[PDB]
Amino acid sequence: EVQLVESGGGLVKAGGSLILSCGVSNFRISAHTMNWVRRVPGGGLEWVASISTSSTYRDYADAVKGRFTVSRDDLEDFVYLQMHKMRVEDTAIYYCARKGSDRLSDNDPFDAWGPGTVVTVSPASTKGPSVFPLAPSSKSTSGGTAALGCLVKDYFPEPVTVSWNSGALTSGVHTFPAVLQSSGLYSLSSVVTVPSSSLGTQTYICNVNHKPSNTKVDKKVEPK
Amino acid sequence: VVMTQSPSTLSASVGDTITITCRASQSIETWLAWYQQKPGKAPKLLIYKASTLKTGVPSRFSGSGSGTEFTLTISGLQFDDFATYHCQHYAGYSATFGQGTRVEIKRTVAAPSVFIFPPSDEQLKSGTASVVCLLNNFYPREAKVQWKVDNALQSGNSQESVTEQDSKDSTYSLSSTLTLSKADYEKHKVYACEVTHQGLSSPVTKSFNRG
């Protein structure tokens, strides 16, 4: 019979965004006011948002006003909920529900709800990186050119600034574009080529700065 | 418009006739619905416009009231009827809910059995330390767990889970996991679990040292 089905949930970091859709079975939405409701971990329900028939008026809860947007698609029977600048207390189960009843009237309750989609907001809006050295080989291609660097792992969000020897070394330095890991965190590598002879005297420090997390790290790199 | 539901927890027995109340901050006419929700499911509509029983819904449910005070009544509880109930006010294009009432099977107060587990060597070797605290067979549900490391109280690095009431004894059980990185786990000696519950007159603490 009358069914709703929400999709779009998952894990969001604080300050981030997430959009939910909600499709239906066995009725047309154009006759009803559509609503988004959420169940918080405490146990209770909170009314989130609503659109009137043909989008005439949209209403929001105080706590989400300015951050969330509710939209509707009468032709293909879908409802949307845009969630921006997400707060930890936005963590809840989200349901779309229709205003209606057995005998439709001027003012109706919520007679039909979707099963719900889980939305969790991580407290960590930001994560600092770990800096591991890429040690050069003390024996490889004779007294010629050797390569060394820093591997920067597991940071959020972009970007990171990498300099060498307090910014004094620029020649032959390559800072690589960041790479997004399946963990949801970034990882780049910064390398430099130097003469093999300079290994046994000159020390090399890479300066990693991650403005978002307010994290500055220096890493001394030397052969094993 | 603010809604106030009461009580938070209603403890009852099969066959009982129980009542939940809901008080509106201002006059609301008869614009109120009641909803039943089973954990992990959608809310079901029960009664709307204060006293109109939705079709299909069993007749042992009934609501009343008008103005500022409304009451839900369940005449002859069934096992199926143990869940959370919500009151809702609906007017215009918005709505507003009550805090919710959880209905549970009543039994005698029972203090938890507390157990603390060290992380296994296998998991430690992989780089993650999981410390588990088990609260076994307790009633009522509210029981506060507090992790302590070298007598510093922990925050935001643990997660917990709770069972539904047991079929035999109607008790709850709680499992709390403290998660730390290998390197952080090595930095400290004593790992403690402090349990506060109505059954215990004093907060009970279980602990262990790394080997």
Partner: peptide, 20 residues
């Protein structure tokens, strides 16, 4: 809340157009 120049008629349960 109601749309502009509408108030909440508690008796009706709907946003009604009002002037004042």
């Amino acid at each position: 809340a109601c749309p502009p120049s509408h108030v909440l008629d508690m008796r009706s349960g709907t946003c009604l157009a009002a002037e004042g």
